[PDB]
Amino acid sequence: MEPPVQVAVIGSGGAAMAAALKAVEQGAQVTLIERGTIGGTCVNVGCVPSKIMIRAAHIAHLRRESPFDGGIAATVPTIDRSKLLAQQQARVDELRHAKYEGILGGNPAITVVHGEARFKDDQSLTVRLNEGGERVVMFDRCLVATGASPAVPPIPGLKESPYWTSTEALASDTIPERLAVIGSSVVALELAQAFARLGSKVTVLARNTLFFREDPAIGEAVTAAFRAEGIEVLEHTQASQVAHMDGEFVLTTTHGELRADKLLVATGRTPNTRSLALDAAGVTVNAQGAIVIDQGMRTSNPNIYAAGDCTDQPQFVYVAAAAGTRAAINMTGGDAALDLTAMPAVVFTDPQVATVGYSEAEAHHDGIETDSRTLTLDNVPRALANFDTRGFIKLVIEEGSHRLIGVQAVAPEAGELIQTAALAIRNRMTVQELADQLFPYLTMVEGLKLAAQTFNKDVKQLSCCAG
Amino acid sequence: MEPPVQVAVIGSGGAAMAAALKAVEQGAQVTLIERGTIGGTCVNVGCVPSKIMIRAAHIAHLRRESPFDGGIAATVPTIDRSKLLAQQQARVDELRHAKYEGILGGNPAITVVHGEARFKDDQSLTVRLNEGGERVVMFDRCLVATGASPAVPPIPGLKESPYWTSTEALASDTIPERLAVIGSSVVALELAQAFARLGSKVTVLARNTLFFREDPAIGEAVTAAFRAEGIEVLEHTQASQVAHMDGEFVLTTTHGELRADKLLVATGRTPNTRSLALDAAGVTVNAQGAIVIDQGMRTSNPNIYAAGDCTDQPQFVYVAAAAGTRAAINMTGGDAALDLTAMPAVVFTDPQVATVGYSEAEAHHDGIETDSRTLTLDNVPRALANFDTRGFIKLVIEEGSHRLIGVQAVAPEAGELIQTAALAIRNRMTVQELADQLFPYLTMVEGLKLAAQTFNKDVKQLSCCAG
Ligand SMILES: Cc1cc2nc3c(=O)[nH]c(=O)nc-3n(C[C@H](O)[C@H](O)[C@H](O)COP(=O)(O)OP(=O)(O)OC[C@H]3O[C@@H](n4cnc5c(N)ncnc54)[C@H](O)[C@@H]3O)c2cc1C
Ligand SMILES: Cc1cc2nc3c(=O)[nH]c(=O)nc-3n(C[C@H](O)[C@H](O)[C@H](O)COP(=O)(O)OP(=O)(O)OC[C@H]3O[C@@H](n4cnc5c(N)ncnc54)[C@H](O)[C@@H]3O)c2cc1C
């Protein structure tokens, strides 16, 4: 008789969870090692708490102002952050148990180890247990899903100051009167707007422009939206010195001296691979410290796989989870590959930013001839009925075939409409085909149809005679 | 040389507008006859003003209460309906000019006639001009796009009372202290909730249950939502007598006497065909007075077509417009057909109701073997982060092929997510295929993926290990 394959999984986030359970489903015995709180980033200090805080911020914002204030009185709502934090944390704790702890526990095929793991060789790990001492974990196959951590730049004086990373910001029980934010990452912007809406006077220090690595139209729309609601966005600005004196932060910048009660550093994230002793297992990493893998999540060592934020993969929990599931399949004798061709991405600012497929620049870089159309939101019925036309919907197609290969949008509910675009791309639809489909009038997603029609029709024909 | 085809179009709503412009594009000369305001129903007294009022109502509602009131103070906002009405009307007037008047005017190929048309024979119309007198309009082909009007039941005393139809309700400059609503139609419910949120004490008299003709789960969720915010829903209730005494309505019902300041009658709509003298042109209508047509919008008379609410077609402006465009193609020698297989439908209540494709009952009626899954919103991350789990997402598939053939949902933003379902159905995707696609975490549309996964996975595996 054959013994169950011994699978070791380092981490307990989205990638590790998906892998652990898939491995067990495929008949393997799993030993999962986690050094901190079970659940990793998303449920504890990532997606979940941040989206909850953003929703609370949205309510506070709408109680403060709206496009209908001429007929509906508005007020400055009193905010009790302690109560909001308690509500937020209760849901986080509830989900951690329901989707992580409760599933890992009570399963004789899964052994959870509380400690920090490192490779001993390519078939075993050495674990420094949280309760002291060590333990060796032998394995046939191992999945590294250690995620990433907030990056902290070597700005003089920052290291020893009481600054915040996204974790401390989300866990704060008070809304600071003044919040300075260093960075222009998605995390930086989502938190910047949430705190602003909850009461903070926010100043964002962007080294370049917002969404510098994305299509330029995106950063322009978001920057204008932030400024419109009192958020200061200092472009091409960096702090050369950080100091904390007399109970406040003092930042020396290229724009002058800036003072704030709290400082959020959200420049980016780095892979958690330095404590893994990857060299002992022959696992190669790139210049950024990320573990190199192929579409099957296989590393340079045939018996070791990697998935999630500790690799070069896009940093989204749904990508990490999909990768973990497929890595487990391959660790158990299968043959699976991760396809990210129609991977959507959403930024939970207001308006939201959403993208899928190729941007014009990205297509060109890959030698693809394209054409595009950019429809401003003042052409979308839903936006007009809401009296909020900030934003746009951009479609990118391949020349000749007219196949839709990319969509970028800045608009309320962009995250919802982007999935229609994702399916259109997945099914290799042309813009003509998308435009000929029936869409509900007065929905934001109708904007996709309207934009598609502009490839063969005039903007003046939309919502009238563009069929 | 050949002369331009003479096309007559009766009406100026979505169907007529799309047809008129398509006909001209195809080389025809158009004579469009309209007895009332240009633009018809949607822009003037339908979709546009109603969605604007609903958005205003949403803001008022959120300023009054939210799932985050434990940490964000709320207040009863003062409402100035005169100001809201002015804003609403200005957008309506703006859109009427931009998408209707400005496009019809200044075009030598289009002649707009202000009057009421009726058939003289199958090649001409007699028009009673609004300014007096008549005119004959000869045509080679004619499109009837006369729409429908609010139905008014023969309830004793109703006829002579100062009741409202959706038109008077949308045009009211005051929010009534008490509003009674007779009917359970989409129009009745959308307006009922809007007025309630803007300040009225609303009572809905439904002859049966809400969404009686739809899947039962829909009516149950909507009824619970209405009651949750103070809207009284009297099921299986009809008014046997209407009276207006001492400045108020007095309704005798099976539930007892009900008094209200205003009365909205929104039971349904009837086709505008009684004044057309259709018999003079040999155009057949059904028992409801609707004009009978085929998929090419052709009537019993080869030279006359019909599209929109005056036919048996679904009453949506996007359906009317699509039909008008295709009718114009056929009137000008083409061969087009309207495909409604993936037609989405949205109800702008909160939560919204959205459907596409077959419901279980509808599939069975057509001899299709099916299976389904109903995912309650407390299983959708976005709903949980919003602390509002009222609703559900239901998927209907064909047995054997596992092809998705229908989706019904009750949830915030259901109108946005339903389009993803529409494209999935259009592309004949199976639930497994839909479930294997990447969806953004914490978006309502992710609910489609989660529901799809329940066809092969347990609800406890969702957002964890259902891959
Ligand atoms: C503020 C914020 C907001 C975000 N918003 C979104 C969003 O809206 N949508 C989205 O899809 N993604 C979002 N993300 C990103 C998403 O959270 C991550 O991509 C995802 O959680 C990564 O999952 P993972 O399994 O790769 O890693 P992780 O969940 O980060 O976990 C790795 C785990 O391994 C442990 N570990 C590390 N080294 C060792 C070791 N040597 N031994 C034992 N255990 C070790 C860690 O302690 C941790 O528990 C957000 C992130 C943040 C920080
Ligand atoms: C309150 C309300 C809310 C709605 N919400 C939505 C929604 O959210 N989404 C959606 O898609 N649909 C919605 N609808 C329905 C949508 O408005 C209609 O289906 C659509 O407007 C019908 O277009 P049509 O061109 O067929 O007719 P219409 O736009 O109704 O116009 C027919 C025109 O012909 C004229 N006419 C009639 N008889 C004659 C004659 N003998 N001679 C000359 N002119 C004549 C009329 O006066 C009118 O201008 C709503 C309707 C109402 C009333």
UniProtKB/Swiss-Prot annotation, chains A, B:
Q: Which residues form a coiled coil?
A: none
The upper taxonomy is: Bacteria, Pseudomonadati, Pseudomonadota, Gammaproteobacteria, Pseudomonadales
Query: Does the record's keyword annotation contain Flavoprotein?
Result: yes
Keywords linked to the UniProt accession: Disulfide bond, FAD, Flavoprotein, Mercuric resistance, Mercury, Metal-binding, NADP, Oxidoreductase, Plasmid, Redox-active center, Transposable element
Q: What is the recorded name of this protein?
A: Mercuric reductase
The yes or no answer to whether the keyword Disulfide bond is present is yes
One GO biological process term is:
detoxification of mercury ion
- Which E.C. number(s) belong to this protein? 1.16.1.1
Q: How is the cofactor bound?
A: Binds 1 FAD per subunit.
List all disulphide bridges recorded for this chain: C42-C47
Q: Which gene encodes it?
A: merA
